[PDB]
Amino acid sequence: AMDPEFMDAAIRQSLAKLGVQSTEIQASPVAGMKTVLTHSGVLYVTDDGKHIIQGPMYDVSGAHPVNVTNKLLMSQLNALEKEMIVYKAPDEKHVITVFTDITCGYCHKLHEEMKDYNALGITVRYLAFPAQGLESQAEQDMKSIWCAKDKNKAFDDAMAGKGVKPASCDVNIADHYALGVQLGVSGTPAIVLSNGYVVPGYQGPKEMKAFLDEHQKQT
Amino acid sequence: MDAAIRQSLAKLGVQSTEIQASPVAGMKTVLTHSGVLYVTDDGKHIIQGPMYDVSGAHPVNVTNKLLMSQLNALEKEMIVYKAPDEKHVITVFTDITCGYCHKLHEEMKDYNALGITVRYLAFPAQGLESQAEQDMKSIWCAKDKNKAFDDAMAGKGVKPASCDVNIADHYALGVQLGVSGTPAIVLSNGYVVPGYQGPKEMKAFLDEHQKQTS
């Protein structure tokens, strides 16, 4: 703590020149490179700040390749647990975190199936991801929903077509969005597994259950 | 040997064509037909390219800068339309079935007039085994490549011709450079300008880029 971290200072300065203005810098599993969190994604930067490569980074030593960028990010993701809209399964077999958008068609499709996911042992945890960006009406509307006293009711209501009641709190949707971007989320709904794996596409409950079971076995 | 890197790649179904140094100690530049990977010496970790050097005034894609060796090595297989008073050299990936490639070729005199030399490589979007690939092979195997290319682009059909020219190598290089559609304009430092850009625009862009990277 009394020892200077002057090399990280070079990273920040190097990124500042590029317009990347705020950073979190952590170790990486690769010697002489640091993991750098930015609002625009994860960057792997050499210790001296001179070279940059966009994530993700994969660990390919095992039977299946794993995205260690996303695996690492599950610490950030899990730290946002209190800001999640959680629909817990009675007999929980899997927990997925879903980046969702109240204006996205398959997010409606997915939510309509919540009972069936839950019945199959799948707990669904929601974070907000306005696919149209942070200055869209959806960001504003989702913030109200996430600031409601009953988040589950507000979210249910909105997806049924009832309409959000205004509300404010300290929850920043921009933080959910940055996490989504760092995890490689572009299209919603984006289903993220407990090890960071982002499921390609939408899958209904029966398909998702089999996928989750097999994913657990293999990884 | 790079056994560890090759072992990991083999496990993922990936065939490297080259493995060479990178700017990062302990990590190699690995060329494959699908693109460039950065892989640790121990074969444990992979990040897809490209890598940028950001130490200068402007970010430089060093992956593509490196590939300019591979690219310039293909000199003799390029169809070059030289400007009389050469100010810039650009390499262009083209397809004889691509509308914008035809627009570009029709305007070659204009690019040349502004001091821009154009060097073509083949990039048949339809991939290998396609009719476009074969026809373009025939063109690149002509005794007179410029004549054959002008003739085809003017709509005069394609004359059968055989030689050792491997279009797939052009295609692989384009893919490694980040080319996905044609025409693709590549600068002397590997920078890709995606799509078509006009002679006056290109000249101004080329002049500014030279000032930026000198």
PDB file of N, CA and C in Angstrom, chain B residues 79-143:
ATOM      1  N   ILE B  79      -1.721  -7.090 -59.530  1.00  0.00           N
ATOM      2  CA  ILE B  79      -1.988  -6.364 -60.760  1.00  0.00           C
ATOM      3  C   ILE B  79      -1.858  -4.901 -60.385  1.00  0.00           C
ATOM      4  N   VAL B  80      -0.773  -4.282 -60.839  1.00  0.00           N
ATOM      5  CA  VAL B  80      -0.428  -2.943 -60.422  1.00  0.00           C
ATOM      6  C   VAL B  80      -0.746  -1.922 -61.512  1.00  0.00           C
ATOM      7  N   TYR B  81      -1.528  -0.905 -61.157  1.00  0.00           N
ATOM      8  CA  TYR B  81      -1.736   0.226 -62.042  1.00  0.00           C
ATOM      9  C   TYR B  81      -1.019   1.409 -61.428  1.00  0.00           C
ATOM     10  N   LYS B  82       0.148   1.723 -61.976  1.00  0.00           N
ATOM     11  CA  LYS B  82       1.023   2.710 -61.351  1.00  0.00           C
ATOM     12  C   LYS B  82       0.641   4.123 -61.764  1.00  0.00           C
ATOM     13  N   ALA B  83       0.743   5.057 -60.830  1.00  0.00           N
ATOM     14  CA  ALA B  83       0.589   6.467 -61.151  1.00  0.00           C
ATOM     15  C   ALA B  83       1.912   6.931 -61.740  1.00  0.00           C
ATOM     16  N   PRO B  84       1.859   7.758 -62.794  1.00  0.00           N
ATOM     17  CA  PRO B  84       3.077   8.321 -63.392  1.00  0.00           C
ATOM     18  C   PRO B  84       3.892   9.088 -62.360  1.00  0.00           C
ATOM     19  N   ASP B  85       3.227   9.936 -61.584  1.00  0.00           N
ATOM     20  CA  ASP B  85       3.899  10.709 -60.548  1.00  0.00           C
ATOM     21  C   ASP B  85       3.496  10.208 -59.130  1.00  0.00           C
ATOM     22  N   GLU B  86       3.955   9.002 -58.798  1.00  0.00           N
ATOM     23  CA  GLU B  86       3.523   8.249 -57.617  1.00  0.00           C
ATOM     24  C   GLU B  86       3.730   8.954 -56.286  1.00  0.00           C
ATOM     25  N   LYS B  87       2.634   9.173 -55.574  1.00  0.00           N
ATOM     26  CA  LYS B  87       2.666   9.826 -54.277  1.00  0.00           C
ATOM     27  C   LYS B  87       2.287   8.805 -53.210  1.00  0.00           C
ATOM     28  N   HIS B  88       1.422   7.861 -53.575  1.00  0.00           N
ATOM     29  CA  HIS B  88       0.923   6.872 -52.624  1.00  0.00           C
ATOM     30  C   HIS B  88       0.782   5.544 -53.313  1.00  0.00           C
ATOM     31  N   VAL B  89       0.942   4.478 -52.543  1.00  0.00           N
ATOM     32  CA  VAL B  89       0.706   3.143 -53.051  1.00  0.00           C
ATOM     33  C   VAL B  89      -0.379   2.509 -52.205  1.00  0.00           C
ATOM     34  N   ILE B  90      -1.440   2.040 -52.844  1.00  0.00           N
ATOM     35  CA  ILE B  90      -2.462   1.308 -52.116  1.00  0.00           C
ATOM     36  C   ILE B  90      -2.670  -0.054 -52.737  1.00  0.00           C
ATOM     37  N   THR B  91      -2.986  -1.003 -51.875  1.00  0.00           N
ATOM     38  CA  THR B  91      -3.257  -2.347 -52.293  1.00  0.00           C
ATOM     39  C   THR B  91      -4.740  -2.546 -52.122  1.00  0.00           C
ATOM     40  N   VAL B  92      -5.388  -3.081 -53.141  1.00  0.00           N
ATOM     41  CA  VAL B  92      -6.844  -3.181 -53.107  1.00  0.00           C
ATOM     42  C   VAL B  92      -7.304  -4.606 -53.312  1.00  0.00           C
ATOM     43  N   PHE B  93      -8.129  -5.100 -52.393  1.00  0.00           N
ATOM     44  CA  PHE B  93      -8.757  -6.399 -52.568  1.00  0.00           C
ATOM     45  C   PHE B  93     -10.045  -6.197 -53.355  1.00  0.00           C
ATOM     46  N   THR B  94     -10.186  -6.961 -54.429  1.00  0.00           N
ATOM     47  CA  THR B  94     -11.233  -6.742 -55.408  1.00  0.00           C
ATOM     48  C   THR B  94     -11.858  -8.061 -55.838  1.00  0.00           C
ATOM     49  N   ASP B  95     -13.026  -7.948 -56.459  1.00  0.00           N
ATOM     50  CA  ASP B  95     -13.842  -9.082 -56.854  1.00  0.00           C
ATOM     51  C   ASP B  95     -14.462  -8.649 -58.177  1.00  0.00           C
ATOM     52  N   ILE B  96     -14.385  -9.488 -59.203  1.00  0.00           N
ATOM     53  CA  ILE B  96     -14.915  -9.084 -60.506  1.00  0.00           C
ATOM     54  C   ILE B  96     -16.431  -9.103 -60.537  1.00  0.00           C
ATOM     55  N   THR B  97     -17.046  -9.648 -59.490  1.00  0.00           N
ATOM     56  CA  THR B  97     -18.506  -9.664 -59.385  1.00  0.00           C
ATOM     57  C   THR B  97     -19.043  -8.553 -58.469  1.00  0.00           C
ATOM     58  N   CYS B  98     -18.169  -7.646 -58.050  1.00  0.00           N
ATOM     59  CA  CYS B  98     -18.542  -6.613 -57.088  1.00  0.00           C
ATOM     60  C   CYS B  98     -18.758  -5.248 -57.754  1.00  0.00           C
ATOM     61  N   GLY B  99     -19.983  -4.735 -57.655  1.00  0.00           N
ATOM     62  CA  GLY B  99     -20.366  -3.488 -58.306  1.00  0.00           C
ATOM     63  C   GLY B  99     -19.425  -2.332 -58.021  1.00  0.00           C
ATOM     64  N   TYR B 100     -19.088  -2.148 -56.751  1.00  0.00           N
ATOM     65  CA  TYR B 100     -18.213  -1.044 -56.359  1.00  0.00           C
ATOM     66  C   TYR B 100     -16.765  -1.239 -56.808  1.00  0.00           C
ATOM     67  N   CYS B 101     -16.351  -2.486 -56.991  1.00  0.00           N
ATOM     68  CA  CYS B 101     -15.041  -2.747 -57.567  1.00  0.00           C
ATOM     69  C   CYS B 101     -14.997  -2.269 -59.019  1.00  0.00           C
ATOM     70  N   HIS B 102     -16.129  -2.390 -59.711  1.00  0.00           N
ATOM     71  CA  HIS B 102     -16.221  -1.933 -61.098  1.00  0.00           C
ATOM     72  C   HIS B 102     -16.188  -0.413 -61.183  1.00  0.00           C
ATOM     73  N   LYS B 103     -16.843   0.246 -60.228  1.00  0.00           N
ATOM     74  CA  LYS B 103     -16.824   1.703 -60.136  1.00  0.00           C
ATOM     75  C   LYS B 103     -15.401   2.173 -59.909  1.00  0.00           C
ATOM     76  N   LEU B 104     -14.722   1.513 -58.974  1.00  0.00           N
ATOM     77  CA  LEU B 104     -13.339   1.845 -58.677  1.00  0.00           C
ATOM     78  C   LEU B 104     -12.461   1.648 -59.911  1.00  0.00           C
ATOM     79  N   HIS B 105     -12.579   0.498 -60.574  1.00  0.00           N
ATOM     80  CA  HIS B 105     -11.706   0.272 -61.716  1.00  0.00           C
ATOM     81  C   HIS B 105     -11.924   1.274 -62.844  1.00  0.00           C
ATOM     82  N   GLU B 106     -13.175   1.629 -63.111  1.00  0.00           N
ATOM     83  CA  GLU B 106     -13.475   2.640 -64.129  1.00  0.00           C
ATOM     84  C   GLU B 106     -12.806   3.977 -63.829  1.00  0.00           C
ATOM     85  N   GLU B 107     -12.580   4.248 -62.555  1.00  0.00           N
ATOM     86  CA  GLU B 107     -12.003   5.508 -62.143  1.00  0.00           C
ATOM     87  C   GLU B 107     -10.481   5.428 -61.930  1.00  0.00           C
ATOM     88  N   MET B 108      -9.858   4.353 -62.412  1.00  0.00           N
ATOM     89  CA  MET B 108      -8.425   4.139 -62.184  1.00  0.00           C
ATOM     90  C   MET B 108      -7.576   5.303 -62.706  1.00  0.00           C
ATOM     91  N   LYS B 109      -7.949   5.826 -63.872  1.00  0.00           N
ATOM     92  CA  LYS B 109      -7.234   6.953 -64.466  1.00  0.00           C
ATOM     93  C   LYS B 109      -7.241   8.149 -63.512  1.00  0.00           C
ATOM     94  N   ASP B 110      -8.338   8.301 -62.787  1.00  0.00           N
ATOM     95  CA  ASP B 110      -8.482   9.408 -61.852  1.00  0.00           C
ATOM     96  C   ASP B 110      -7.611   9.233 -60.607  1.00  0.00           C
ATOM     97  N   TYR B 111      -7.592   8.018 -60.060  1.00  0.00           N
ATOM     98  CA  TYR B 111      -6.684   7.710 -58.962  1.00  0.00           C
ATOM     99  C   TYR B 111      -5.229   7.886 -59.404  1.00  0.00           C
ATOM    100  N   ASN B 112      -4.898   7.381 -60.591  1.00  0.00           N
ATOM    101  CA  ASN B 112      -3.537   7.537 -61.112  1.00  0.00           C
ATOM    102  C   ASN B 112      -3.155   8.998 -61.347  1.00  0.00           C
ATOM    103  N   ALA B 113      -4.067   9.766 -61.937  1.00  0.00           N
ATOM    104  CA  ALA B 113      -3.878  11.206 -62.099  1.00  0.00           C
ATOM    105  C   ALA B 113      -3.519  11.923 -60.791  1.00  0.00           C
ATOM    106  N   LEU B 114      -4.051  11.467 -59.659  1.00  0.00           N
ATOM    107  CA  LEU B 114      -3.736  12.123 -58.389  1.00  0.00           C
ATOM    108  C   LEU B 114      -2.503  11.546 -57.685  1.00  0.00           C
ATOM    109  N   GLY B 115      -1.778  10.664 -58.370  1.00  0.00           N
ATOM    110  CA  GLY B 115      -0.538  10.123 -57.834  1.00  0.00           C
ATOM    111  C   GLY B 115      -0.722   8.876 -56.978  1.00  0.00           C
ATOM    112  N   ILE B 116      -1.839   8.192 -57.175  1.00  0.00           N
ATOM    113  CA  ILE B 116      -2.135   7.008 -56.400  1.00  0.00           C
ATOM    114  C   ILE B 116      -1.923   5.765 -57.243  1.00  0.00           C
ATOM    115  N   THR B 117      -0.976   4.937 -56.822  1.00  0.00           N
ATOM    116  CA  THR B 117      -0.759   3.656 -57.461  1.00  0.00           C
ATOM    117  C   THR B 117      -1.664   2.621 -56.804  1.00  0.00           C
ATOM    118  N   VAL B 118      -2.311   1.805 -57.627  1.00  0.00           N
ATOM    119  CA  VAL B 118      -3.204   0.784 -57.121  1.00  0.00           C
ATOM    120  C   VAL B 118      -2.688  -0.610 -57.460  1.00  0.00           C
ATOM    121  N   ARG B 119      -2.673  -1.469 -56.447  1.00  0.00           N
ATOM    122  CA  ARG B 119      -2.150  -2.819 -56.578  1.00  0.00           C
ATOM    123  C   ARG B 119      -3.233  -3.796 -56.161  1.00  0.00           C
ATOM    124  N   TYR B 120      -3.712  -4.613 -57.088  1.00  0.00           N
ATOM    125  CA  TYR B 120      -4.833  -5.493 -56.772  1.00  0.00           C
ATOM    126  C   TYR B 120      -4.390  -6.866 -56.252  1.00  0.00           C
ATOM    127  N   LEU B 121      -5.151  -7.386 -55.293  1.00  0.00           N
ATOM    128  CA  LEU B 121      -5.125  -8.809 -54.943  1.00  0.00           C
ATOM    129  C   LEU B 121      -6.562  -9.309 -55.071  1.00  0.00           C
ATOM    130  N   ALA B 122      -6.744 -10.616 -55.250  1.00  0.00           N
ATOM    131  CA  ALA B 122      -8.073 -11.193 -55.454  1.00  0.00           C
ATOM    132  C   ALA B 122      -8.771 -11.529 -54.133  1.00  0.00           C
ATOM    133  N   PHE B 123     -10.045 -11.161 -54.013  1.00  0.00           N
ATOM    134  CA  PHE B 123     -10.818 -11.500 -52.821  1.00  0.00           C
ATOM    135  C   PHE B 123     -12.254 -11.913 -53.161  1.00  0.00           C
ATOM    136  N   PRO B 124     -12.424 -13.106 -53.770  1.00  0.00           N
ATOM    137  CA  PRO B 124     -13.769 -13.533 -54.172  1.00  0.00           C
ATOM    138  C   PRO B 124     -14.637 -13.824 -52.969  1.00  0.00           C
ATOM    139  N   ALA B 125     -15.602 -12.943 -52.702  1.00  0.00           N
ATOM    140  CA  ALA B 125     -16.500 -13.051 -51.547  1.00  0.00           C
ATOM    141  C   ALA B 125     -17.127 -14.434 -51.439  1.00  0.00           C
ATOM    142  N   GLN B 126     -17.521 -14.980 -52.586  1.00  0.00           N
ATOM    143  CA  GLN B 126     -18.089 -16.323 -52.684  1.00  0.00           C
ATOM    144  C   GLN B 126     -17.144 -17.436 -52.178  1.00  0.00           C
ATOM    145  N   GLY B 127     -15.923 -17.061 -51.797  1.00  0.00           N
ATOM    146  CA  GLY B 127     -14.975 -17.989 -51.208  1.00  0.00           C
ATOM    147  C   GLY B 127     -14.220 -18.764 -52.264  1.00  0.00           C
ATOM    148  N   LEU B 128     -13.450 -19.764 -51.835  1.00  0.00           N
ATOM    149  CA  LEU B 128     -12.751 -20.659 -52.751  1.00  0.00           C
ATOM    150  C   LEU B 128     -13.744 -21.667 -53.312  1.00  0.00           C
ATOM    151  N   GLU B 129     -13.351 -22.332 -54.398  1.00  0.00           N
ATOM    152  CA  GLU B 129     -14.221 -23.252 -55.152  1.00  0.00           C
ATOM    153  C   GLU B 129     -15.344 -22.556 -55.937  1.00  0.00           C
ATOM    154  N   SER B 130     -15.441 -21.234 -55.817  1.00  0.00           N
ATOM    155  CA  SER B 130     -16.488 -20.486 -56.514  1.00  0.00           C
ATOM    156  C   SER B 130     -16.071 -20.104 -57.930  1.00  0.00           C
ATOM    157  N   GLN B 131     -17.068 -19.817 -58.768  1.00  0.00           N
ATOM    158  CA  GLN B 131     -16.831 -19.409 -60.150  1.00  0.00           C
ATOM    159  C   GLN B 131     -15.983 -18.133 -60.208  1.00  0.00           C
ATOM    160  N   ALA B 132     -16.230 -17.227 -59.265  1.00  0.00           N
ATOM    161  CA  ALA B 132     -15.497 -15.974 -59.196  1.00  0.00           C
ATOM    162  C   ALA B 132     -14.027 -16.233 -58.883  1.00  0.00           C
ATOM    163  N   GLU B 133     -13.777 -17.204 -58.014  1.00  0.00           N
ATOM    164  CA  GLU B 133     -12.419 -17.589 -57.660  1.00  0.00           C
ATOM    165  C   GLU B 133     -11.660 -18.132 -58.865  1.00  0.00           C
ATOM    166  N   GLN B 134     -12.323 -18.992 -59.629  1.00  0.00           N
ATOM    167  CA  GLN B 134     -11.710 -19.631 -60.790  1.00  0.00           C
ATOM    168  C   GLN B 134     -11.420 -18.620 -61.889  1.00  0.00           C
ATOM    169  N   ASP B 135     -12.422 -17.803 -62.207  1.00  0.00           N
ATOM    170  CA  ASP B 135     -12.271 -16.751 -63.202  1.00  0.00           C
ATOM    171  C   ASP B 135     -11.134 -15.804 -62.814  1.00  0.00           C
ATOM    172  N   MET B 136     -11.081 -15.435 -61.537  1.00  0.00           N
ATOM    173  CA  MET B 136     -10.021 -14.558 -61.067  1.00  0.00           C
ATOM    174  C   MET B 136      -8.656 -15.248 -61.072  1.00  0.00           C
ATOM    175  N   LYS B 137      -8.640 -16.564 -60.854  1.00  0.00           N
ATOM    176  CA  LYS B 137      -7.410 -17.327 -61.041  1.00  0.00           C
ATOM    177  C   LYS B 137      -6.950 -17.216 -62.491  1.00  0.00           C
ATOM    178  N   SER B 138      -7.882 -17.418 -63.422  1.00  0.00           N
ATOM    179  CA  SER B 138      -7.593 -17.287 -64.852  1.00  0.00           C
ATOM    180  C   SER B 138      -7.013 -15.931 -65.200  1.00  0.00           C
ATOM    181  N   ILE B 139      -7.554 -14.884 -64.581  1.00  0.00           N
ATOM    182  CA  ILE B 139      -7.082 -13.529 -64.824  1.00  0.00           C
ATOM    183  C   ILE B 139      -5.659 -13.330 -64.320  1.00  0.00           C
ATOM    184  N   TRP B 140      -5.403 -13.760 -63.091  1.00  0.00           N
ATOM    185  CA  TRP B 140      -4.092 -13.586 -62.492  1.00  0.00           C
ATOM    186  C   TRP B 140      -3.038 -14.460 -63.171  1.00  0.00           C
ATOM    187  N   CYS B 141      -3.479 -15.457 -63.940  1.00  0.00           N
ATOM    188  CA  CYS B 141      -2.541 -16.362 -64.629  1.00  0.00           C
ATOM    189  C   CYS B 141      -2.296 -15.952 -66.075  1.00  0.00           C
ATOM    190  N   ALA B 142      -2.817 -14.798 -66.463  1.00  0.00           N
ATOM    191  CA  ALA B 142      -2.645 -14.317 -67.824  1.00  0.00           C
ATOM    192  C   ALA B 142      -1.206 -13.900 -68.053  1.00  0.00           C
ATOM    193  N   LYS B 143      -0.759 -13.992 -69.302  1.00  0.00           N
ATOM    194  CA  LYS B 143       0.558 -13.488 -69.670  1.00  0.00           C
ATOM    195  C   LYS B 143       0.611 -12.003 -69.316  1.00  0.00           C
TER     196      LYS B 143
END
